[PDB]
C-alpha cells in the first residue's frame, strides 16, 4: 500500500526513498536501475523493494469520507 519501511531481506531502511525515487525518474529522467543505485540500493534484495513498489495508497486516499466532494 504505502512504501515499506525496511527491505524484507536486508533490514535496510527503504521508506525514506520512495518520494525521491519518483523525482529521479521524473525530473532527472534516469532509468530505473540508475536511480536505484543513486539512492544506495545495492543488493538486489533492496533494489526490488523500490523498483516494484505499487503506491496503491494514493488510490485509497481518493475516497475520503470526511470531506464534501
Amino acid at each position: 500500500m504505502i512504501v515499506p519501511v525496511r527491505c524484507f531481506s536486508c533490514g535496510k531502511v527503504v521508506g525514506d526513498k520512495w518520494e525521491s525515487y519518483l523525482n529521479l525518474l521524473q525530473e532527472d529522467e534516469l532509468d530505473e536501475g540508475t536511480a536505484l543505485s543513486r539512492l544506495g540500493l545495492k543488493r538486489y534484495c533492496c533494489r526490488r523493494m523500490i523498483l516494484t513498489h505499487v503506491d496503491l495508497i494514493e488510490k485509497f486516499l481518493r475516497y475520503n469520507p470526511l470531506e464534501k466532494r
Partner: protein
C-alpha cells in the same frame, strides 16, 4: 457530534427518537465517527 453523513459529509448528532437522516442532505445513511479514545497496540 457522534455521526457523519455518508453523502455530504456534514458532521452531526442525534437524540432520542430523532430523524435518522442528514439534516442537510436528507440522506438516510450515517457513519459513526471515531472519537478520541484509547486503543493500545504492540508494534509487532
Amino acid at each position: 457530534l457522534k455521526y457523519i453523513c455518508a453523502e455530504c459529509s456534514s458532521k452531526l448528532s442525534l437524540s432520542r427518537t430523532d430523524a435518522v437522516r442528514c439534516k442537510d442532505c436528507g440522506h438516510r445513511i450515517l457513519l459513526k465517527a471515531r472519537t478520541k479514545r484509547l486503543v493500545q497496540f504492540e508494534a509487532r
